[PDB]
């Protein structure tokens, strides 16, 4: 069952083993139960840690209900996949990914004062192809000022660094003007909407670009796995797959009392049930009660 | 889908588009009788004007029924399509059973015949291993968990290089 | 037996969700 804090995340999500648990919880509440006390505790590190480890339990089955658009004609199945992942991030408690990684940027370098360590401490979160170019243009403005560039904003060296890194950003191909005018806003709602109708266009191009990069990586990895697999004779393939399946089955059956092991074994029995149900009536598929 | 929809018996489709099934409706004042004719089947119903808005009160919410996962089914679909692409070029192999007669055996250099019979055994090996379709269910499970860990990011599942680059421009070019 | 249910069949089967639940159950009381 659930422990009164996992069930507060599973309300808006639509994955099956969360929806059936929420439905059994409401079956408990309608049939004469009181709601347990929500904890007014757990100081901020434990709060964001349990957010990190509780949104994981609602995102990780959400990826498996999302089918990859591997090798399809048109960029619109990539838009389907990225929209599904956006909806999964929305139902997982994450924000828009732009403002989410902006929040991570602010969280990472709250204690950085110069601009070289703001490019050092956010090395894991930005592209190294872009981090190398930003470090080299910062070494250029460092050769200009002959002083460490300060990460304050009102410094003239940082102003020249901003006017050079905007050219670096257009050199990467992404327009910094529509993005800065989006997050800086305008007076009237009409010239804010005219900026948003460019920023959302770039935003769609950006998320479909990295989603298409992801499905191209899975396409090439599946092609490499198949081409390393087709070079084997069939008895070696059957022995390797049966031995790997038996070993990872022994790894589950060894864990006695573990909940994940019991769920693993029940899903194995459900897979065998699916094989039996397609074996009984293969004209229509599995037997589903309706 | 939203809970309130706004469609039905207004800008509705008026007729058929295929030769497999026929349909024509009755656009009367208050009511509507459909007449759908499909070969050996015949159906003519009488529906009301508000009988189409009560249709979308309950939602269907169609869902997949997958053996392992919908993601695993998509990866197994791509492995089946790649096995189709390899099977299309094991289908253009030249027929070598026509050169098994003994009038090709004894006119041949012996090592060339050794090479030819070993090439035939190699083709039978390649064809037995490209049509092992039971093994795609365990080939797909080696692509799954690294992908599922990549989508289990600490910032956002749909995150990528370009959106992080754009937000780094937004973080850097503003006043700290 | 056969023809079990619909939401019992909609479950993404070999997703983790429980190993993460195991580590989140044995981590948070050990860190509070």
């Amino acid at each position: 069952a659930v422990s009164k804090k996992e069930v507060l995340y599973f309300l808006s999500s639509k994955d099956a083993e969360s929806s059936t648990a929420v439905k059994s919880y409401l079956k408990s509440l309608y049939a004469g139960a009181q709601v347990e006390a929500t904890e007014t505790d757990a100081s901020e590190l434990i709060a964001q840690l349990e957010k990190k480890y509780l949104s994981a339990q609602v995102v990780e089955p959400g990826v498996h209900n999302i089918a990859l658009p591997l090798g399809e004609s048109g960029s619109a199945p990539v838009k389907r996949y990225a929209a599904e992942l956006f909806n999964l991030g929305a139902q997982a408690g994450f924000e828009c990914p732009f403002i989410e990684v902006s929040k991570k940027f602010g969280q990472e370098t709250a204690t950085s004062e110069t601009v070289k360590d703001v490019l050092n401490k956010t090395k894991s979160y930005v592209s190294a192809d872009y981090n190398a170019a930003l470090n080299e243009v910062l070494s250029s403005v460092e050769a200009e000022i002959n002083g460490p560039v300060l990460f304050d904003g009102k410094t003239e060296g940082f102003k020249k660094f901003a006017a050079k890194a905007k050219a670096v950003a257009v050199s990467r191909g992404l327009p910094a003007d529509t993005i800065l005018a989006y997050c800086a806003g305008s007076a009237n709602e009409d010239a804010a909407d005219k900026v948003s109708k460019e920023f959302f266009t770039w935003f769609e191009s950006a998320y479909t670009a990295d989603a298409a990069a992801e499905v191209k990586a899975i396409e090439a990895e599946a092609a490499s796995i198949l081409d390393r697999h087709l070079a084997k004779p069939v008895a070696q393939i059957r022995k390797e797959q049966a031995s790997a399946y038996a070993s990872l089955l022994k790894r589950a059956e060894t864990a006695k009392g573990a909940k994940w092991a019991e769920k693993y074994l029940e899903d194995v029995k459900a897979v065998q049930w699916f094989d039996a149900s397609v074996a009984e009536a293969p004209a229509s598929g599995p037997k589903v009660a309706a | 889908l939203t809970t309130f929809t706004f469609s039905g018996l207004q800008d509705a489709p008026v007729a058929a588009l295929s030769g497999s099934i026929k349909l024509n409706v009755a656009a009367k004042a208050g009511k509507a009788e459909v007449t759908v004719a499909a070969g050996a089947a015949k159906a003519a119903t009488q529906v009301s004007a508000a009988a189409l808005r009560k249709l979308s009160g309950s939602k269907i919410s169609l869902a997949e029924v997958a053996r392992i996962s919908v993601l695993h089914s998509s990866i197994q679909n791509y492995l089946l399509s790649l096995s189709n692409e390899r099977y299309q070029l094991l289908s253009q192999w030249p027929d070598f059973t026509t050169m098994y007669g003994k009038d090709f055996y004894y006119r041949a250099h012996p090592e060339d015949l050794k090479k030819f019979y070993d090439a035939a055994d190699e083709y039978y090996k390649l064809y037995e291993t490209v049509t092992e379709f039971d093994s795609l269910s365990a080939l797909a499970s080696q692509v799954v968990p690294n992908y599922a860990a990549r989508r289990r990011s600490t910032v956002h599942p749909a995150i990528g290089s370009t959106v992080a680059d754009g937000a780094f421009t937004n973080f850097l070019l503003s006043k700290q | 037996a056969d023809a079990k249910a619909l939401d019992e069949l909609r479950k993404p089967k070999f997703s983790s969700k429980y190993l993460i639940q195991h580590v989140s159950q044995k981590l948070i009381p050990a860190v509070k």
């Binding site: 990190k52 994981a56 990684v101 894991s124 979160y125 930005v126 592209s127 190294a128 990069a213 992801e214 191209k216 990586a217 899975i218 090439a220 990895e221 092609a223 490499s224 198949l226 081409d227 390393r228 087709l230 070079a231 399946y245 990872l248 089955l249 790894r251 994940w260 693993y264 194995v268 897979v271 | 053996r67 392992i68 695993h72 390899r86 070029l89 094991l90 390649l126 269910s137 365990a138 797909a140 499970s141 080696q142 799954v144 968990p145 860990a149 990549r150 289990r152 990011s153 600490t154 910032v155 995150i159 990528g160 290089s161 992080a164 | 070999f14 983790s16 190993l19 993460i20 195991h22 580590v23």
Partner: peptide, 30 residues
């Protein structure tokens, strides 16, 4: 068909490492 279960996070946002194209089509045409 069953995969090993992992519970770990990726904090890095990198390119997804598009792997090498293997030479099976050219070997089979050869």
């Amino acid at each position: 068909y069953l995969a090993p279960l992992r519970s770990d996070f990726t904090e890095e946002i990198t390119a997804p490492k598009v792997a090498s194209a293997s030479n099976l089509v050219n070997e089979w045409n050869n």
